[PDB]
């Protein structure tokens, strides 16, 4: 029953929202572990964009 919209929010966000809605009968196995130890960045989908203007890659060379 989990929402299959991977481009909307994260797995945690969608599962939490559905549980709050009550559509999800019970929290999946990993939800508690994710909540306790979330990753440094929420796994939200994001389409890569190609730099066009004067913006440059901030990766500095090593010397």
């Amino acid at each position: 029953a989990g929402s299959r919209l991977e481009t909307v929010g994260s797995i945690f966000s969608r599962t939490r929202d559905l549980v709050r809605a009550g559509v999800l009968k019970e929290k999946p196995l990993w939800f508690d572990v994710y909540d306790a130890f979330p990753p440094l960045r929420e796994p939200v989908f994001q389409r890569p964009r190609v730099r066009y203007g004067k913006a440059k890659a901030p990766i500095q060379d090593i010397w």
Binding site: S3, R4, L5, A21, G22
Partner: protein, 331 residues
């Protein structure tokens, strides 16, 4: 001749002639089960065979062979005719459709709850509303757009394709139930803030509204809002009104909207609400989970928000659309 008679199933097959060269490309009759009301052991002679069409015993006594009187058999025949005609009349009579957006349109018609899921999953709480039906070269099929919603924020939409309309509906709803969003709702009756979005070439401008304001939106938006669980909102659709684009953009905006709690946490401040009905009383709707900022936050003297010309015109009263605010049925 007895040996020439055929079974009722074959007779009805031949009579209906569903399969045929004409029926191949569309270049009516009803299968009336003549054995429905018949009772075994009943004949025009009205013979009461013990143990078959009458009770075997009587007051503890075995019944014997008897024949109904002429008048009794006539009454039985009349009653059978009455039952047959009542059944035929009840079959003929029809219950009017739960009309949709229009008499001859599929828009808005409710398809009922989605089919139950295999692994003990049920969806009786989800209402399903059609939004669009189209025809679509075959050596023609039907495409459908439907939406489903639990009425408590969890709503989704899907497309279906099938040679048969009913199959298309089934596919569309069974697929929608797997594509649910969760539209956060303010006080469980309206969106959190005004939303202005453009999807493809369809502009959607949705405005929060106080309770009782009702849904003043494009009828498709009304259907979607009812499914989601939004009771009060205003919505203006501009540009191309392609139904699929409208639905997709509406869901995109509603899902992307931002909650008061999220805003409070982001900006590290109390979110305070002011109501005309409550005068100067400040209502702390949401507060940040983290420490609250001691910084009074910038007092932006003049905002840079991109105002809507139509909104400004309406506010200033220059708007005089005869169609705006026309009284309409409860939505």
């Amino acid at each position: 001749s007895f040996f020439t008679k055929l079974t009722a199933d074959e007779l009805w097959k031949g009579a209906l002639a569903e399969t045929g060269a004409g029926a191949k490309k569309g270049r009516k009759k009803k299968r009336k089960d003549l054995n429905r009301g018949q009772i075994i052991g009943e004949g025009r002679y009205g013979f009461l065979w013990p143990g078959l069409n009458v009770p075997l015993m009587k007051n503890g006594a075995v019944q014997t062979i008897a024949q109904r009187s002429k008048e009794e058999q006539e009454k039985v025949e009349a009653d059978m005719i009455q039952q047959r005609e009542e059944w035929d009349r009840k079959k003929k009579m029809k219950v009017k459709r739960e009309r949709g957006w229009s008499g001859n349109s599929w828009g808005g018609i409710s398809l009922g709850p989605p089919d139950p899921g295999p692994c003990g999953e049920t969806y009786e709480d989800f209402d399903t509303r059609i939004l669009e039906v189209r025809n679509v070269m075959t050596a023609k099929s039907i495409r459908v757009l439907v939406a489903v919603g639990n009425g408590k924020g969890a709503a989704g939409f899907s497309i279906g394709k099938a040679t048969d309309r009913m199959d298309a509906f089934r596919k569309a709803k069974n697929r929608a139930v797997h594509h649910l969003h969760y539209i956060e709702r303010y006080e469980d009756h309206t969106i959190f803030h005004d939303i202005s979005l453009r999807f493809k070439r369809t502009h959607i401008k949705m405005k929060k509204q106080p309770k009782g304001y009702g849904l003043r939106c494009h009828r498709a938006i009304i259907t979607i809002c009812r499914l989601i669980g939004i009771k009060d909102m205003y919505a203006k659709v501009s540009g191309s009104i392609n139904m699929l684009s409208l639905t997709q953009g509406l869901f995109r905006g509603l899902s992307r909207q931002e909650t008061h709690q999220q805003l409070a946490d982001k900006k590290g401040l109390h979110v305070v609400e002011i109501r005309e009905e409550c005068g100067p009383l400040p209502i702390v709707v949401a507060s940040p989970r983290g420490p609250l900022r001691k910084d009074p936050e910038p007092e932006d003297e003049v905002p840079d928000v991109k105002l809507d010309w139509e909104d400004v015109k309406t506010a200033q009263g220059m708007k005089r659309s005869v169609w705006s605010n026309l009284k309409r049925a409860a939505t």
